[PDB]
Design a protein around this ligand. Structure first.
Ligand SMILES: CO[C@@H]1O[C@H](CO)[C@H](O)[C@H](OC(=O)c2ccc(C)cc2)[C@@H]1OC(=O)c1ccc(C(F)(F)F)cc1[N+](=O)[O-]
Ligand SMILES: [Cl-]
Ligand SMILES: [Cl-]
Length: 138
């Protein structure tokens, strides 16, 4: 497994038609996962499966600017299961990140950070065994 937390450099940032693929397995009794697409200290796109928020499973998406979290976007569909292998695919489109999990569309997140070519790191953290993280231009 790769060591979590794991930083994947995104050379020259992200661009439409860039597909980021994360393969891992959820640990047993997981509490959280996080993908953080970073523009220096800012978080352009935070994707945060929470396995127990007041006894519900919810995915929280948000942006952090100058250390301030913004308005959360919340999804009720929760495709992750403790102990089970997953594939997350984040496809950069012109207006949004498009996220599929296990080949099923999950959510999109509108670009709040506009300087896509400055989102040059992906942080992968939380309660996973991380198998691989890569990108390809489609
Ligand atoms: C207002 O809460 C905040 O919301 C942000 C998104 O809008 C981030 O997710 C942010 O967390 C981080 O940035 C973060 C967290 C951990 C680490 C290691 C690094 C960075 C923080 O979340 C919690 O703290 C949170 C909110 C709810 C709950 C829940 F209720 F679900 F348990 C748990 C947490 N928990 O971070 O643990
Ligand atoms: Cl590693
Ligand atoms: Cl910007």
């Amino acid at each position: 497994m790769l060591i979590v937390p794991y930083n994947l450099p995104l050379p020259g940032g992200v661009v439409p038609r860039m597909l980021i693929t994360i393969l891992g397995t959820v640990k047993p009794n997981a509490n959280r996962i996080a993908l953080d697409f970073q523009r220096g200290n800012d978080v352009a796109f935070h994707f945060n499966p929470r396995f127990n928020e007041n006894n519900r499973r919810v995915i929280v998406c948000n942006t952090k600017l100058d250390n301030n979290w913004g308005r959360e976007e919340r999804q009720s569909v929760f495709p992750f299961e403790s102990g089970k292998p997953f594939k997350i695919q984040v496809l950069v489109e012109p207006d949004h990140f498009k996220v599929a999990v296990n080949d099923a569309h999950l959510l999109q997140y509108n670009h709040r950070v506009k300087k896509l070519n400055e989102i040059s790191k992906l942080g992968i953290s939380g309660d996973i065994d991380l198998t691989s993280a890569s990108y390809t231009m489609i």
